[PDB]
Write a protein that holds these residues in place. Structure first.
Motif, short mmCIF file in Angstrom:
data_model
loop_
_atom_site.label_atom_id
_atom_site.label_comp_id
_atom_site.label_asym_id
_atom_site.label_seq_id
_atom_site.Cartn_x
_atom_site.Cartn_y
_atom_site.Cartn_z
N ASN A 13 0.99 -1.21 -0.05
CA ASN A 13 -0.10 0.01 0.06
C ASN A 13 0.99 1.26 0.16
O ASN A 13 1.06 1.87 1.21
CB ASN A 13 -0.81 -0.06 1.09
N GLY A 14 1.53 1.49 -1.20
CA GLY A 14 2.05 2.86 -1.27
C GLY A 14 1.50 4.01 -1.93
O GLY A 14 0.24 3.86 -2.29
N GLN A 15 2.28 5.04 -2.50
CA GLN A 15 1.77 5.98 -2.82
C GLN A 15 2.32 6.20 -4.28
O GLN A 15 3.24 5.43 -4.70
CB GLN A 15 2.25 7.51 -1.96
N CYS A 16 1.57 7.10 -5.32
CA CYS A 16 2.11 7.17 -6.52
C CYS A 16 2.36 8.78 -6.84
O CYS A 16 1.64 9.51 -6.83
CB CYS A 16 0.88 6.83 -7.65
N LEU A 26 9.88 2.22 -5.04
CA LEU A 26 9.31 0.93 -4.90
C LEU A 26 9.30 0.05 -6.26
O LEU A 26 10.35 -0.61 -6.61
CB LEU A 26 7.95 0.50 -4.44
N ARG A 27 8.39 0.45 -7.15
CA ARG A 27 8.31 -0.11 -8.60
C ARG A 27 7.54 0.80 -9.39
O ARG A 27 7.09 1.76 -9.05
CB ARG A 27 7.64 -1.52 -8.44
N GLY A 28 7.31 0.32 -10.59
CA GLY A 28 6.49 1.01 -11.61
C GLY A 28 5.03 0.66 -11.61
O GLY A 28 4.36 0.78 -12.72
N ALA A 29 4.55 -0.14 -10.50
CA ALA A 29 3.32 -0.65 -10.59
C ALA A 29 2.26 0.25 -10.60
O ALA A 29 0.94 0.19 -10.89
CB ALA A 29 3.12 -1.45 -9.24
N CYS A 30 2.59 1.80 -10.47
CA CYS A 30 1.73 2.70 -10.45
C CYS A 30 1.47 3.25 -11.88
O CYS A 30 2.02 3.04 -12.76
CB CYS A 30 2.28 3.94 -9.53
N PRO A 31 0.44 4.17 -12.05
CA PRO A 31 -0.07 4.51 -13.39
C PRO A 31 0.77 5.69 -13.82
O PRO A 31 1.86 6.10 -13.21
CB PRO A 31 -1.27 5.07 -13.06
N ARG A 32 0.84 5.68 -15.02
CA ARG A 32 1.90 6.45 -15.92
C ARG A 32 1.57 8.13 -15.23
O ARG A 32 0.84 8.49 -14.62
CB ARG A 32 1.47 6.76 -17.33
N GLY A 33 3.03 8.74 -15.14
CA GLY A 33 3.00 10.01 -14.71
C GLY A 33 3.46 9.85 -13.30
O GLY A 33 3.91 10.98 -13.00
N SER A 34 3.17 8.83 -12.74
CA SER A 34 3.83 8.69 -11.35
C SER A 34 4.43 7.22 -11.04
O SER A 34 4.21 6.43 -12.02
CB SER A 34 2.65 8.86 -10.28
#
Length: 44
Positions: A13-16, A26-34
Motif C-alpha cells: 500500500n504505497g503512494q504514486c 518501490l516499482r512502476g506498478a503505479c499509473p503513468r505520470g507517477s
C-alpha cells in the motif's frame, strides 16, 4: 498484467508520485505520470 491481481504497490500500500520527491522508490506498478513511492512510516 500486475495491477488488479495483486501488485506490489497494493500489498505494501504505497503512494504514486514522480521522482521529484523525498518519497522512497518501490516499482512502476503505479499509473503513468507517477511511480510507486514508499511513505515515511515505521521509520523508513
Amino acid at each position: 498484467r500486475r495491477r488488479r491481481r495483486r501488485p506490489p504497490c497494493e500489498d505494501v500500500n504505497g503512494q504514486c508520485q514522480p521522482r521529484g520527491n523525498p518519497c522512497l522508490r518501490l516499482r512502476g506498478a503505479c499509473p503513468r505520470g507517477s511511480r510507486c513511492c514508499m511513505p515515511t512510516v515505521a521509520a523508513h
